[model samples]
Target: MEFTEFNLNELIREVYVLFEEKIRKMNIDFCFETDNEDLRVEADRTRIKQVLINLVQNAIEATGENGKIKITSEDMYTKVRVSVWNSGPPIPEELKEKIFSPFFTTKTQGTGLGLSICRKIIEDEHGGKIWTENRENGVVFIFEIPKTPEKR
Candidate 1:
């Protein structure tokens, strides 16, 4: 991956703008937040954008009309935690971990490889981690990649 340093929140906004039309049409109350204004991350910008798009697309599909979606990032010292939450049906507890498995999907269409690819981008490629969390009213997909590469 061609890693570079850039503001993580701006990257999220770029992804948000990509779906602004659909989000406005769906009446989804979308929100974005970051504990640090200039939260920068060192990684492949395009790959990270792809991951964000996948997570947001999934959130949009799962959320109903007038539903809510929140994108939040927290400063975790060594890394940043970014989460995409949607007011959609909570994922079944049994399938929580399984969702990251290759070829695992609940949707009728698509190969169901999005999340798996996302996992690979964050973990295998960038030495990070990604997972899902079930909220009382929705589900959240969170990922964290180190701000800088580990000393070699």
Candidate 2:
């Protein structure tokens, strides 16, 4: 489907519901916050949602039963930032830089394409940015896209 034909908010909501279900199954505390109303982007809805699902699943796996996962969206000057934060063990310094590389994973059963595919969807397809940061209490995975629709 064409990027211009996509419904960003609907796609995000669908992925959010799926993430919530997964989190419920894992018994993790979760919350979603958004200030932007129906932010639309010129991108593939399915791909963006897929990236979100991957991140949410990774967060669920990283966090403990009682740990919290928070997903938030903010509108910047000319871009939107979506962040997924989780209360989990901080990513080891050694693995920080390699997380987005293909086949790079610390989990025993992880295929390691989660973050890599996220980067591909955001950066390559949407002309956006994807990154990770270690907070004092947890970790955050952030992705950003320009407000103006890109021709795809």
Candidate 3:
């Protein structure tokens, strides 16, 4: 993967628009917000797009054909944090710890590697991390990639 420095928020906006037609067909409300407009990170454009797509699609599924999904990005510590929020019934505590592990999933689709791939792309390929949290009305998935690539 070729990692280049680019605006992460812009990349997200681009990816979000790609799914608009499908999201409209699915009958869901989708919106995005960026607290840090100029945040740039060294990353693989394709893979990062992959991460956002997976997270958003997962949100669409968790929210079903109703509810809303929001994607937001902001400056987080020394890295950039991109978040996807969705309306859901929330996940159980025990299962949250295992979500990022390969082959672990509550859904019967795509070999359950969607999130694993997100973690791999963020942590393994870029020196970053992907995680999730249970919100009162929904679930939140967050990814953090270093502002500057680690020189290894």
Candidate 4:
């Protein structure tokens, strides 16, 4: 669905609820926080939600049971930064650059399209950027969207 057609805040809340439900079913500990209210952006809502779901799911799986997954968002000047982090193993240096490539995944069942699709949704479609960084305790998957999307 078109991002402009729906309320962005509602979309985010919906995804958060869905993620929480999944976490509950898995009996995992998780937390989500957002500071901004009108954190709306111009893009496809479904695609954005897809990206969020994929990243969060990966984080949850990586963290395993009893581990914590945290999702946070903030308004950064002209862009919004969304981050999904978990207390999982750090991303290997050798595979860091290839994570966004299509058909590249470290998981057995992973099709490798999760991060690739995220890249297309954020960068290719919404004129944003997506990347991963190795944190001291875990890995963080971050994506940014311009306050105003680029003209098609």
Top lDDT prediction, candidate number: 1
Clashes of 1: 0
Per-residue lDDT of 1-152 in model 3, one digit per residue for the tens? Answer: 68788898888888778888778888888878888789888789899999998898889888988678988898875789888999888878887768778898777665788888898998998888888888769999988888888776
lDDT of 2 at 27: 78
lDDT of 1 at 113: 88
| Error of model 2, residue 17, in angstroms | 1.5
Greater-TM-score candidate between 1 and 4: 1
Which rank order by lDDT, best down to worst? 1, 3, 4, 2
TM-score of each: 0.95, 0.88, 0.92, 0.89
lDDT of 2 by residue, 1-152 (tens): 45655445566678877667666777788887878666766667778888888988888888868778888888775778889999988887887769999999888998999999998888987789998899869999999987666645
- Residue 57, model 3: Cα distance from true site in angstroms: 1.0
**Candidates by TM-score, descending order:** 1, 3, 4, 2
The lDDT values for all models are 0.91, 0.81, 0.85, 0.82
RMSD of each: 1.0, 2.1, 1.5, 1.9
Please report, as a residue range, the 10-residue window in candidate 4 with the lowest summed lDDT: 1-10
- How close to the true structure is residue 65 of candidate 1, measured as C-alpha lDDT? 88
